[model samples]
Target: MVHYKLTYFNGRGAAEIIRQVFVLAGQDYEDVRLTHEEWPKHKASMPFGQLPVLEVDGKQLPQSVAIVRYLARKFGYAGKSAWEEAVVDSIADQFKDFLNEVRPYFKVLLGMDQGDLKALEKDVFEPARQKFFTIVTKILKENKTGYLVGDSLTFADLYVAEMGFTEHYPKLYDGFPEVKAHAEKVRSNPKLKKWIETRPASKF
Candidate 1:
């Protein structure tokens, strides 16, 4: 059996990108899902009091980004050269910033009064969404190679594509024709498609 296992809640969040890496790489892993109650009990065993931890050969890895980057390199998705890897890391950081800005608003809206949600969505969320989408689109347009770094698929392409489909501001992709097309291409890759359908507890 595969030694790598990922532990996370049912939702996408931090785990989805790493899952995508596993899929694109054709690697097999066990995905462990936990309920809110189960997570607390499990948290102590995790390396950093975090979910989305990876267990490889009985060694625990905390931090979702670190785990994903490690897996990406291991599975041949990161990039071939140092410069290409740097490009991948740069784009991943951009996506991370976008997620960080939107995450607080997401937490605030959950179980909030409708009026509060409306105000937050209108006043705070929409502007940030617009700015983020514009920047992402501009980056994609200026990259010139179409694949973020070069002709081959890189970790950043997979990360961005997965995040675009699963995150709060999915419409960020709609504004950019190139980005939208690229995301669709990544989404439709045969290995990824098969993994999405077959992976245990692969919801969302």
Candidate 2:
């Protein structure tokens, strides 16, 4: 067995999906959380000077997406076939772009920005949410699998269900029952549910 350790900030942010994937896979790893005050001391030691670094048998791996994809592939949660894997990657990248589009809204939510919340929600957040739900729901409808890429639960599905459909934003998937059901499906896993119930609460 490989010794695994994940180092990230105390909050969820980018590392939440990675942590959820580990829980779903039943993989045991050390979760190292660095508070904002403590982050400065450890920044230089990270591979790319970022948190969410995964250490496999003492070897460091940078980039949250890269670590998540590796863990997903290693634990047989990637996808069924080569094409499906490609689709997973596509959706993952799309999710990244989606996050980028909606980050300003999150900044307001996190109190990092004092922008007009109502205007930002209506203009920036709503359009992006609609587009993401529309695209994801269309893909789900076409796949007929209740998952993002394949018949089985891929990392993309979990990433979307957990990170994309967060508790902070309710009713985002209200019109899309399939999307809602998919999110619930991932959350219904007993292990993941326990982790979600027990983990520390954070703004992001």
Candidate 3:
């Protein structure tokens, strides 16, 4: 078996989807969560001076999306065909784009910003979240598979599930029932159920 090690701060943040992929695939990996204090000391050794890096048999790989895609393809959760994989990629990218829109609000969540949190959430975060939900809802409606792409679960489904949103803003799913149902379906998987129940909780 290949050795796998993932390093990130001790929070879900950008790394949770990667961990979910591992659990969904029933794969064993070393989940190395660094505290803020320990992160500074380890920063210089990391590629691009970043956390959320994955090491496969000691060779380091950076970028959260890259790591998730690698593991998804390895575990047969990427997609069923070339076209499907592309669709999956587009959806994941779209979600990341939405995430990019709310980066300022994220900084507030991380305690890196002293800006008005409520204003940011109301003016920026919620709007972005609604747009993302609308986009996802359209795809979900067209697919009719209760998944983002194809019939089975893909990393995209787990990547943008409502759970990721509700972690920060609990009421974000209010008007998007289809998206909420999709999230429920993803989490209902036996493996995910067990992992969610047992995994360490952290504020992200």
Candidate 4:
């Protein structure tokens, strides 16, 4: 038997996508949630000063995106060709850029001052999110397979669905009909649907 350990804070942060991938793959792993105080004790052990590290067979893996991509490939969801893989990675990169821009707003939501929040909303979130959504929507609209990559599901599809539609800001869906449809398609995938129904409440 193989044992996997995921260490992260209470919120989804960088760990949620990998957790969802595990569930979608029907793989069993232990999820350890750390509190702010607990994080200090554990941080020294992490490869980087970050939460959401994965440990498999006693070896630690850092970087959330790398871990999720590895799991997607391991579970046969990474798409079939080099071109498809490149597309998947491209989508992931776009999503990551969008998230980085939104991190300040997330900080504000966690308790930054109203003034700071307003500044971010006006100067950062609104413009960046709008552009990101527009580009993603355009890509989805033009996709020949109705997925982010090849004819079947890929890591890109799952990552975009989770980050763009469900997790980041659900309200943003209304503006992008094709993206909304694609998100539904991914969310309704049999394995992922079943996992969502049966998995334990994630720490997030």
Candidate 5:
């Protein structure tokens, strides 16, 4: 039997960081993907009836962040120490909050109309995003680790690079040169370079 099996939508979304962790750790797993149409066929079996689930042995685990955090700790991506791990957790939580704020625009990318998307961009997305990125910029500046938390790679770094936040939203870094450079530093990691360069191409 396979040691691990990750089930998620075909495109990179919540499950991408877990995949990055596996790749960065040089581990192997079954990357099970489904089309939107194919998801409902298997949804009921998931722990929370969600699209992303991690199967270990014969059991299933739910929640994207929980799965990644558990595996990251087990596999060495959490951080070098307990203090650093807590800091890494805070960094990940920031992204979680940021995503919740900007999630409406994701609908825009998924084919929402100009009028609705533009309104959200102006009234909702722009301000919320700028607020979040501003915090990220300052945090990185103060941490001075180059990576998000400690002096080396952690799940926080994987989270940022896998999400492509700066590349897709270039202006997110307009005032935060360090955050932009932070993404580049994570992108430059030697162990992760092959996966970053050759990950399955997708629409996200």
Candidate 6:
């Protein structure tokens, strides 16, 4: 009973994580990509005036993280035990926090003087944000083989792999090598890689 179509701006941003969920779940969904112009015309249908809406069965669900979380569980990517579930929650939550931390850097890149941007990054954004990556690397290197939780792939890995792990973004992994390797592992999934290669391109 799986019927869903994901609508988002024609870019990765937060929606890519949800797309990866569909890929890993081996499910088919209509990946509806809209541009800025296309969105306003369709905005009225969105649950909260947002683009990334997952049309599930007959219901429209908004919020990128929540959509992926529910689907990850629905598609059997959730952990096998309560403790594992808790670990998954903690890891996924940390990834969200990590994104939030670096968000200002991305936002500031638009207004800050070009000459000053790199200096700001070097002195503040890069080093400060890297602490989160250090924690992620520690978590991965510490226990339970390779995956984020419960000896196997979980939503935690999918979200973490995405938030910023690929070579597509250079400063993605400032200090966490294991995190980089983990992302590469996720990318190696044939379907996921295919999606990455074929999806409509966006600068973000």
List, residue by residue over 1-204, the lDDT tens digit for candidate 3. 989999999988789999999998889999999999899899998999997999999999999999999999989999999999999999999988887898889889776988888999999998898899999899999999898899999999888873454455667678999888899899888998888888887766
Clashes of each: 0, 0, 0, 0, 0, 0
Local error of candidate 1 at residue 11 (angstroms): 2.7
Compare the candidates by lDDT and give the number of the best one.
3
TM-score of each: 0.83, 0.92, 0.90, 0.83, 0.88, 0.87
Better of 3 and 6 by lDDT: 3
Residue clash pairs of candidate 2: none
Q: Judging by TM-score, tell me the better candidate of 4 and 6.
A: 6
lDDT of 4 by residue, 31-103 (tens): 8988888788889899987878999999999998889888888887777876777778888888888878877
What lDDT score belongs to each candidate, Candidate 1 first? Answer: 0.76, 0.85, 0.88, 0.78, 0.80, 0.77
- Alpha carbon lDDT of residue 95, candidate 5? 80
Better of 2 and 5 by lDDT: 2
lDDT of 2 by residue, 1-204 (tens): 889999998878788888888888888889999988999999999988987899999999999899889999888788888887888999989978988998889879876898899999999989888899899889988988677776777889877887644557776787788888888877777978898899998866
After best superposition, candidate 5 residue 11: deviation in angstroms?
Answer: 1.4
Q: Write the per-residue lDDT of candidate 6 for residues 39-84, one digit (tens) a residue.
A: 7899998889986899888799999878877888877777778788
lDDT score of residue 112 within candidate 1 = 44
Order of candidate numbers by lDDT, starting with the best: 3, 2, 5, 4, 6, 1
Candidate 5 lDDT at 100 equals 88
**Candidate 6 stretches greater than 4 Å from native:** 107-115, 163-174
Q: Which stretches of candidate 3 lie over 4 Å from their true place?
A: 106-122, 162-168
3 versus 5: better TM-score goes to: 3
Q: After superposition, how far is residue 55 of candidate 2 from its true place, in Å?
A: 0.6
